[model samples]
Target chain A: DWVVAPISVPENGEGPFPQRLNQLKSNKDRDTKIFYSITGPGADSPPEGVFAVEKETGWLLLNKPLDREEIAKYELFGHAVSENGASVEDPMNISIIVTDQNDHKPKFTQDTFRGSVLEGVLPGTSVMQVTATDEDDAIYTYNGVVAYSIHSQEPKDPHDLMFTIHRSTGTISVISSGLDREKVPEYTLTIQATDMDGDGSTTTAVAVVEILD
Target chain B: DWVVAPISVPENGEGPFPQRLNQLKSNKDRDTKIFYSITGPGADSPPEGVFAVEKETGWLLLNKPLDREEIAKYELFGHAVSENGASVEDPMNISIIVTDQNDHKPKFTQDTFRGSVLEGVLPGTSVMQVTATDEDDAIYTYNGVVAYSIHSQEPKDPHDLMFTIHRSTGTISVISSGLDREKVPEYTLTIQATDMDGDGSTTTAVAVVEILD
Candidate 1:
């Protein structure tokens, strides 16, 4: 019989996570004269360490640190001397596996966007609305709540590029803007959002707005 | 019918991670008003702040730092407010949860202990034994077999204490030792074993030497 050590769950990339070793020979019935030892990273002889051994029911505990990355495999074998200190046989191998968890934050599409409304559309008319998307599935909240401003405009700044968004509809409208796409050519705007809320430590997404006539 | 907000899992204690408000009334379907907001450690609210509404499902996505010790609960609520921004009514509450992991280390029973040996026990006989236990059931290896040292001793601390442990039996024995219950009453030692194969942490157990007349 044999044992399979417990699978270790890794933290992102870095890990010296716990990895259990199993027993290769399940029973200790006839082979009473021989035993096993571990040779590898996180073993007792680290760079080399002894992490486990095989017994009757399952695997005997080595109770030592076994570096998962440093050592490839844990070798277990039975040994005895021939008076002359000659090496003996009776060996097997045990492997330790590692798992992973979701530690990455979500990402967004863009910081800002620029759209337009007809000069004759009246106040509260559709202007330009910005949207942002996240990579994580079901990531409802995003850093896409954008702000608008007419950084550089051709025809008298078009009244600060009036823009309002309907939260639910995501629709943008003009509350105060009269456009002359030609004289002002186009309006340039700077837009930005941060993944973090309170301190902006976790930030992402950026965009530029160019008004269309 | 009503739509409640999802709750957030905060650290172990220090809770009631802020929650959101209640539901909005559908005034004859067409005249219904569903207003909501998002707030929490992950939303665009103040530190320890909670975004709320009288009747709306706060569509806030939780992006708060998850510490089993400290957590931010995202709360959302909805309601129907008068076009005149009049008085509000009843609200609902919701919650989200997060699980915690055991990331702490195990400790030793003691740093040192004293034990006695009888001069009568032969060289190959079992003189005395020691053992240690771990809580992380994930730990299959027990360092009881290795890391044996003689920190200090007395009366014929002869031939160093030879330890022989049966991996299967977990029986730690004194393979060799010089003893004299009379002359040297007790020997102080720092017995320790570090998990070699999984997590290399040291835990000690003491043996108080007592010799019979």
Candidate 2:
């Protein structure tokens, strides 16, 4: 039989244990009981404003959900024995590490967006780059799926021009024609970022855009 | 008797012309003759949001101030002939160009500040660089001052462990003894930027700081 041990959160803001020990699967020694013990910051020496768990079933749940920017510390130990308190020699040891997820809205770097396109600029012409940043631990994911469009116009209506976004890099490009700065001094656009769960689950973020002659 | 031209706003958003023209103490053709004809965009011949001023002055007076961020364009043609239009020989040609000022504030790449320091760092140590960018054409001066405390454990009072800022590069260094990341974990600070003039009268900006162990 196999037994699982509880993981402890550390006060130092790093973990040698799994944040969600319940996430553990595939206990090869299933016939045996698994008992887990947690030690370290999240466990006994947890930092102020934070706490760790010692509940049975080899799990570690936060006393409170932590801020993504905040660092978490912890460690775990496991014992191979029967649930009835029967111990076995040489316990199976397992460890886990938890990292923050992207749970933030996209923010723009500039207040007034500016870009230019010569009249008769062809389709797929690169216009300008509007940048935004995400403060999630999973940067690649958080920085993913950003899209753009023309939002407002200097004349309040610039129906002649159209805009497109690059699929991967979020680069904005000119798609339509008849771009006269005089007719439309500037155009403001709202951009959005959608997160896909590496599958189909998606969420979005928005930004402002401005086009200048 | 001297006659000053009626002040007119520069069509292209350029000025200081008001002050320069106001300070004008001399004229061409050995006479005090000045006249100007300027119009805002779409106000001149076939006007289109463009501003133009005739070579002569003694025309319009602009009651508004100039903005350095926006480019101010002007057209000047009339030359100073004499104190009186009848006393002038030739229409003296004058050309004036208005430029933009670097009056913009220094901007950060991101809003929330981010940086890290080692655990066993010495006091007055160079922890990280808090860089800011100025779109004000050229940065006449750049300075980042410590704004506020984000987190701390010892010293009992805030601002004790002073984080000194580099006037030239905006590099932040520990000035006092209270920097202990272990006890405090991080020293989150609000940084302020002073441009053009480093004094409080100049434009300023802010950036949040995040301490990473």
Candidate 3:
């Protein structure tokens, strides 16, 4: 007999033998004992020892913790046969999804960034663009929703604010009319890339800004 | 008798007639009927209707909600006497402390900031200091502990981060050796002033920086 649907395994569960995934059985087992086995990437292929099946009970167990950030899903084939190794039932195609975990922090593309605008530029000018990435599952959970923010500015002005950033878009813009290149000519800023919509673990970047003449 | 010890009254308890502060009574009431009264900035002087006492019951009540941000404490004199005005015990010098409430958001000294660094400054150079001010209590409680951070940086560099900020000191510094003034000579930064140690209400500032020759 064949298995119908795909299964799910959570990422970063715990231990080498983290948890049970599912059980396998065959309808032809009424007359004699049926042996079970699985073969695929996690079973008998490259990333071996990730999934194992009990020959006696047909119970499927994860052999190691999984990282959904690296490998999202695995497709395996199940086999049922007698002690003599003769197959008695059709092969089963089992695909398992590795559920998401907030194990990876949001990261900026560069260790630091660089950009510039001319002195005395009108406010709201687009200065630069920054992109931060997350390696976690992004579709179903908040762990992958990275938010961008500025931490601090070097050489602060006395009476004006000069820049702002888009939270979700990572776009930097000039928001002040006080960009004077004479008194002060450059800026250094700390940027934060945070996951979970600005409420989770964060990574930082330093960016250099230039005021062109 | 005079009431000893300063009392504590919470800020923004409820309505105009939020709650009772205290009661004013005296040992002179043991013999004949004694009336009660209070005099102070909240009572007989400025800011009237802030405090009142029951002439018959000697109960002291707050006539309005208190804001500790503007007015922290109040000192008033309580009085008691026979049906007509007569001396009772010593005058009651009552001081009430309006407990702190997080009614104010952390604010940057400048609406935006200004800063600078040379083209090739070594790492860890002090670039600028952007102080954030909070009108809340500074002695105790987390409301006044404003933390500084960078929100975003303009003119993103593909290979490096150029700046950082101190959380409590509001000091911005250079932490990378990738400060090249030729490719980009200016940076625009977004700074954040957060209360409650980087966890509470946050205010932002735009800061511009200049790259010196």
Q: Who wins the TM-score comparison?
A: 3
Candidate 2 docks at the CAPRI level of: incorrect
TM for candidate 1 is 0.28
> Of models 1 and 3, which has the larger DockQ?
1
Identify the runs in model 2 with alpha carbons over 4 angstroms from their true place: A1-38, A46-62, A66-69, A76-94, A99-102, A136-161, A197-213, B1-213
Candidate 2 lDDT, B1-115, residue by residue in tens = 1112223333334444433332221234233444434443322443332333334534323323544345344443332334465433233223233443444555655555556
Order of models, best lDDT first = 3, 2, 1
State residue B163's C-alpha deviation in candidate 3, in Å.
89
User: Candidate 1: lDDT over CA atoms?
Assistant: 0.40
- Fraction of the native A-B contacts that model 3 recovers: 0.00
Q: What is the C-alpha lDDT of each candidate?
A: 0.40, 0.45, 0.79
Q: Using DockQ as the measure, which candidate wins?
A: 1
What is the C-alpha lDDT profile of model 3 across B50-111, one tens digit per residue? 88888877677887778997788889987777876676655677787899888889877788
User: How well does each candidate superpose onto the true structure, as a TM-score?
Assistant: 0.28, 0.31, 0.48
Which of 1 and 2 is the better model by DockQ?
A: 1
Name the top lDDT candidate: 3
Regions more than 4 Å wrong, model 3: A15-18, B1-213
State the lDDT of candidate 1 residue by residue for B37-119, as single tens digits: 33344334454433334334323333333543243243433333444464344433344444343332444445444444566
Clashes of each: 43, 69, 42
Candidate 2: residue A75 lDDT (0-100): 45
